[PDB]
Symmetry: C4
């Protein structure tokens, strides 16, 4: 039905945030999720829209996103609560014709606003649109526990971290052959960290924020969730292995190459060279 | 409806205790939770109140709580069971006009009584009311697994423990800039441990009971739950990192300072100085 | 209603087995649970009983259990499935007037039989009835993960293991002041292991089977489940602490004594003396 | 009802994949599951079949499977989603009269195809049919976390790995007396890895794919799931024990022998000889 809460995208946002909550990745208001929609997705639900949509400026002009609708998680909102009250915890926003701000068409009730990591999200969407010719539609951030733990013990280096994650589950090279970008620790909720993330997103579908968490990009909620879940699963395996004293054996470079060849992916050169 | 079990506060108590049970923080009757209400919250439900409310004296006079209603978990009751029978496992109590005792207006059926940690709860409520000008409304105690584990291995010192928890997830300094108070081990269920906790609550929103668990205070169930969840998430990360041999790198003092500045919080000086 | 599946005891058996499944304690058919009932419990449901109750001899005469009804889990049945088909996975049995065998009054459909650990259960029930003047009504066995892990690393000694478990969560001494009996490894499903367990049950409410699991006894399903959950929670804490390099500090003997005094329990002397 | 989604086998596939998802064994599209059916199982549901069943060739002729129906998971489909849309994520396929290909009778909607590990599944089904005189009906693959972790630290040797898993939970020798076959790392989704797996399946009901996961075979979904769950539980125990510094004591060869004798199983000689 044209009850917007039963739409594919609201249901999808509930599923993703709820699943991430259950994984233990999103304590308190940790994490944020944005999904780029088409006008066609939200048009049937216009009757559900706020009669008086609030306007909020963006942090900087984002003309590439002009007229683009998104569904987003709210600032300070808990992933745990999305399923209980989607309208309180999520919003549908539509960027205005000059990419200078957006209207909140639905949700974010009681003066709520989009995620404080909106710069990281929207700037990353922009770079991912360019990088994938508009295929990618989702940016997801969560506090993936084992990935976080690894940032205290592994070299915070794209090649090293990528190579370890590839080694920690066979599928990883196939799921993220472009590897995992790593930033230095940076203050969250800033345009600095947002553009730095967006820059890494030019080269990688996953970006790590040391001592904090991960960002993932992909074409759908499931693909993006599954991308992060894959990297976090590998991280979980690695944490066990390291806790047991380290690898006695592992996936070799030659094996990774053979895997890349079979699946028609080009593995990140730097990570492979290790 | 004026079915009191469907009230925001009974539903909130069910959500919090159930979530804590699922987290593995509340084996058996471990843990307790009290929420300060307004008369306005319970007034519509007077028809639901016991016809003959039982009276129980408090451990000591608490005049600051005179005429104040609370919803509380019962002594020896299991968090796991709250969702199955809220009236058996929870009670609404109203402190009398002199703060010498309370009436059990609803729940705690079959001669049940409030939590044996009522001194810790109510005395902490008193100090938190003073410390936050009446903003804080919740005291929550649970057996947060990783926090407990850390009390056997980290120095049981407010500065040291706070600093480590801040390091273990970026959000921590922002969520608890006042840090985490630590008591010596003390016998549970006593007014000694209750006042000692209340005293720490003057300076901190989180207090650790070594080899036992944690107390948290906050304005709402979600904020208080989320506070503990944040500290426990950091603890979980730390336990992994320590199990892997310790930190190769971490969040620096300079980073913590920058984080504090950005979020307009004053980090506990002692923890920052380390 | 007189639908026996909605009885307190069938519902209780479902809750306990399901909770244990979710805890990860009961892979495959691992674990078994028996609850001693009164005639008064099952009498209203006689219409639900098999028209033709099957008779099975006991392994040895158990005259103390003459005419006693129990609800039990089935041999080779999965805890995971109890909630899906209680009649397939559980049975109500009534021991005959000489304690030589029992009739299967309800459940254990398709030729199912009670748990292969029936000797351990019924013999333990006998000793616990004697030891607690008929208060205890439940024997529960599960493959409590951390408790199992500890049996490979701690001395398999009642005093040592008890003392460590007491140290691993403050509540433990209060919950099991009589401590935890430990057997040598023995072949499961035998009367040898059953009587050995029953003998330990004379002195302890918890008994460990090294490299296998735990048995607990108590007056109700919740109290027995909670007993095991408490010991397993302490074990979980200990496994973390040991994985981090061991205790830097812990609950002292003097603290345990003070705790025992406050709660009016007599802690196992041998464990305290360590 | 003749709603095929409510059939025992569709419900069973949902239960197994959902349970495996909840165990954390099947991130993204990790894992695959195939169940051999009888014509009698699917015949009542012919009205539910695609009007126009798609035909797909097999990788190689499999005449032993001629005319045999299976229910299978789809390639790139998520275990997490099976419960949400069984027809999207599962299919019923029937191998043609020469074993050269199959028709997709139901499910795998929107051009979906069976699992990319179909060679491993069907070739293993063939060997297991031969090895168990048609008793085995299920092949299940998942990314069992602790089993995976162990492949980085234990010798990737059938005898060594089997013996350790037997030691890690008492039931293991009884559940898999034939032990656990181990392959070298191989490229997934190939007929090479499929036949290599099928060859190991001649001698073992469990086969490990280092740095990747496990395959299990059994007569029913529950028995096969429970087989993997048992091995993974033992692995979980072992990972804890190894993280704590290793075994101080364990199940002895003499104990394993006694266990084998009692349960009438012949333990894998090589593993016992260690
Ligand atoms: Zn974050
Ligand atoms: Zn409109
Ligand atoms: Zn407590
Ligand atoms: Zn009234
Ligand atoms: Zn057992
Ligand atoms: Zn009758
Ligand atoms: Zn796989
Ligand atoms: Zn037809």
């Amino acid at each position: 039905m044209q009850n917007i809460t039963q739409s594919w995208f609201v249901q999808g946002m509930i599923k993703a945030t709820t699943d991430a909550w259950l994984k233990g990745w999103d304590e308190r208001n940790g994490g944020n999720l944005t999904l780029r929609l088409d006008d066609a997705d939200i048009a049937p639900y216009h009757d559900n829209f706020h009669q008086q949509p609030r306007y909020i400026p963006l942090s900087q002009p984002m003309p590439l996103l002009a007229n683009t609708p998104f569904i987003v998680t709210g600032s300070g909102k808990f992933f745990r609560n999305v399923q209980l009250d989607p309208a309180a915890n999520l919003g549908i926003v539509k960027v205005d014709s000059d990419g200078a701000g957006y209207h909140i068409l639905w949700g974010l009730t009681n003066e709520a606003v989009p995620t404080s990591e909106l710069p990281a999200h929207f700037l990353s969407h922009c770079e991912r649109i360019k990088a994938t010719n508009g295929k990618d539609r989702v940016i997801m951030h969560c506090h993936a526990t084992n990935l976080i733990a690894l940032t205290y013990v592994l070299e915070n280096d794209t090649a090293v971290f990528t190579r370890q994650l590839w080694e920690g589950s066979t599928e990883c090279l196939v799921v993220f052959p472009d590897g995992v970008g790593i930033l230095p620790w940076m203050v969250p909720g800033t345009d600095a960290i947002g553009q730095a993330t967006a820059q890494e997103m030019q080269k990688h579908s996953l970006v790590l924020w040391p001592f904090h968490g991960v960002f993932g990009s992909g074409p759908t909620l499931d693909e993006t969730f599954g991308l992060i879940d894959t990297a976090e699963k590998s991280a979980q395996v690695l944490v066990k292995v390291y806790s047991m004293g380290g690898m006695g054996q592992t996936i070799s470079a030659a094996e990774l190459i053979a895997l890349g060849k079979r699946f028609g992916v080009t593995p990140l050169a730097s990570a492979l060279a290790l």
